[PDB]
Every structure is written in structure tokens, then in C-alpha cells.
Amino acid sequence: RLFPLRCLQISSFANSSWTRTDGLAWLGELQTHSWSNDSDTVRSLKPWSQGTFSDQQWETLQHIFRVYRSSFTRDVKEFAKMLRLSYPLELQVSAGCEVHPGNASNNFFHVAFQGKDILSFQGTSWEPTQEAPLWVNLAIQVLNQDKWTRETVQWLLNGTCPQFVSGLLESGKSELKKQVKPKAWLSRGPSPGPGRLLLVCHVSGFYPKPVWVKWMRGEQEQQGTQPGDILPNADETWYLRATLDVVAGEAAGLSCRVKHSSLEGQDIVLYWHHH
């Protein structure tokens, strides 16, 4: 079951005195939480955003964040003073865990400075990434003094995280299994050459993301299929496009095939010409 938790954060600092730190949270592919720098609280985006957690357990966390944000923003400001960093700044954090079957889990807490890794939290302390500049060692010293923050983080990764996802998993049960059937059509983009044609197969509106689209000749697979990106719809579904550069005289017989979980045995089969 590929359902990891991703607690994500974006901190800005345009100069000495302008900052926004907006965040969010993903459970697999779905957005569960939304944390705007306007809000005191983390907004819950689902009827099941609180796992099995009580309101007071959730309050305990709501507080830890509200402190973390404000503390963070001043600390970064001081590191800039301490490490001589020029002030167009961009910090990010990726924190969370996934729960494997059996007993336990693996967790993570990575932070990044101007889109490059600088440090992760490993076990009981902060650790600098291999590629990281030297001034990181200095920040990492200053961080590893703070035993309370260090232990809080350790508790949040080993303890809270997997208790939370386990709750999220079973209290989100009916929505995580959920199925939305994709719809598909055919079009005709710019022809890649003189006598050729570009066959175009669109597919949109499927919630379980893992999908399978391939152009096929005589019901059996064919090689020139060129798939696109799996892009997001407004209503938290997905859209895939797939193109084939064929000669005009053998567009006849070709077929776009769609394999998705919402469809059982039967698959979606579309034939050319039917644009």
C-alpha cells in the first residue's frame, strides 16, 4: 500500500522583514491539510483529516506547529546573520513517514536551501548532506545544542507520525479505495511530417492515479506509442495524453487502449477513424 505522509513547507524571506511560510500535507496522492501563513491553525481539507486523534491530541499538535512556525522564522533570520547569507532566501521542508505491514515504519525530515539539500534529521540529531556547503556544519552545531527541539522532532517522526497515518488510513478507508471511471476521446494534432499523421488519445477523470494507456494495432501491442505526463484535474482526478506518429495509409485499424482499476475485466477501447 503506497500511502506515505508528506508534511511539506515553503518558507520565503524576501528581505530582512518580509516572510511567508505556507505548508501542506499529502497522504499518498491526496491533499489532507492546508497551512496558510494567515491562519493560526492548520486547516483540515477532509472529513477524515484527524485520524483517530482526539481534539485535544490535535490541539497538542496544532500548538507545536504554531510555535514551530514563529520560532523557525526568527531562527532562519539569525542564521543569515550568523552565516553571512544574502537575503533572497527560500527554505523548504519535507517531513513524514509511511507505515509498512507488520511492526514499524521509516520516517524522514529533509530541509533544503534554494532548492538544494542541506540537512536531514537522522535518528537523534541533525545531519548535513554530502553536497552541502561548509557553513552548514556551523548551523548544524547550533541546532544540535537544542535537546528539546531535537527530542520533539524525534518524537514526531518515531511516535506521532505513524500513529497519525494509521488513524488516517482506517478513518479514510472508503475514500482511499474509491474509484472514478476515466473518459477517453480522439483528436488530430499537427502532422509531424509530410504524408504522416499524429494520432492523439486523451484520457481524463480517473482518481486511482496508476493508469495504463497504449496505442495498439491488431489488438496486440505496438511500439511507437509516446505517452505524456499524468497531469492533475481541478476535481482531484488525473488526465493523460498519448500520441502516435503514423503513416496515413495505416491509421486504419489502430486502437487506443486504457487499463485502469475502476474498469474490471473490460477495458476502454477506441478505434480510428472516430475523431
Epitope: 520560532s71 531562527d75 547550533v142 545544542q145 537544542d146
Partner: T-cell receptor
Framework: ADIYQTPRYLVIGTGKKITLECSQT?????MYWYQQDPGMELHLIHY???????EKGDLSSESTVSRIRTEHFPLTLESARPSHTSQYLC??????????????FGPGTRLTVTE | NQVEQSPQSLIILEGKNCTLQ??????????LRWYKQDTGRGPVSLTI?????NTKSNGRYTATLDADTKQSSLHITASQLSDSASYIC?????????????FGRGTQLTVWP
Amino acid sequence: ADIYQTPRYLVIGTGKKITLECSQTMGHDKMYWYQQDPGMELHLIHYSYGVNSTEKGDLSSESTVSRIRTEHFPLTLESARPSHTSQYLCASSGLRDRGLYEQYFGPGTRLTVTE
Amino acid sequence: NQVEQSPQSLIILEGKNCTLQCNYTVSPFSNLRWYKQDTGRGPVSLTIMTFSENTKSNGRYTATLDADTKQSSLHITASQLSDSASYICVVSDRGSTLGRLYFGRGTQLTVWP
């Protein structure tokens, strides 16, 4: 062992330059400068994270500090006026044992600026 | 100020006990420290306690902490003449050199023979 200051007392004429010496062997990185008027609380004026770093504090004074060697944190006062007559205290934090960074203070310099 | 001390000044006879009070409003609170400032000298640190710990025993001086009620007492046992000093109460809003220190304006203790 220890942190140091020179001189214990200093009397200077209103107009001349002022150097206040502070030495620290402990290898401490973070260092403070404090001012204290007879009776009143301590006001932090300057602080250094070590290395090559010098920052202003919660009091907006006239002095400048520099930190070109770990061991040395000299406070320099350019103008020198009656308003500068105080006691001036050097300090440094840095690990001694268990974990929390204790703060260690100098013996201080009592300045007096006369007309 | 965010760090308040009581009493302002007190006078005790040598070889008697006494207790000094400290209350704070510093948020976030990490650690409370007691400083002994003998006249015309530098402060000497005596005790450092965290939100976590509730009592630190440094020889004759013993500190108390209640992060619940944001209150810390210091307690001198079998006092002597060398105790007569200003006692500063300091609070840190971080558990590393990255935080600020908020100083009290001190309690003035006098010990008489």
C-alpha cells in the same frame, strides 16, 4: 582558564578615542558586550557568534565592536561623552559539561568620561 | 519587562535561611538561570534549569522551577557575609546560543553579622 578585561578603570577626556580590551581563552564562540549604569539592569549592546561576526543588541549605543580573532572582542568608542560613563561587562557562552551553554562574565571596566 | 523579581531588597542575619522569587512571561520559555552579582564585579552563574527539570542544587544555593505557573524560587541555606549581593534572574527563549536572554533587574540581598 577564564575570561579577562583591561583596564578595570578608565578615565578619558571628552573627545578622545576609547579601546576596551576583552580576552577569552575558553575557545567559546558566542560573546556578549553589556552596559550597566549604577543600580540599573543589564543592557546588551553587542554580540558575536564568533568567527567574523559582530551584531548590535537591544540597546542602540555609539560603540563598535570587532572580532578578528576568537580570543579577542575589543569594544571601541569613538566620540566619548559624559553619557558613556558606565560599567562595561564582557561575556561568553560555551559548553562546560552537561549540555546547556553557561554564560561567563569578565571583571568589567568602569569608565568615567570627564569634561 | 518580562522577567520580574521579588523582593527588591532584604536584610537577613548571618547563618539564616532565605528565599528569593522570580516570575517570567517569556514565550517560548526554555531555561531559567540565577546570577550572583557581588558589588563592582561580574555576574557569576549559579544554576541553569529547563522546562524539563524542577530543582538544581549548587552547594548552598538551590533553585526551583514551575514552568506551569512560570515561577522560580532560589533558596539560600546557612547564609554568610559573602552572600550579600545582587541576584539577577535570567530567562532564555531558546535551548541553544541562538536565543535571547531577558534579564531581571535583580534582588538586593544583605547579610549582617
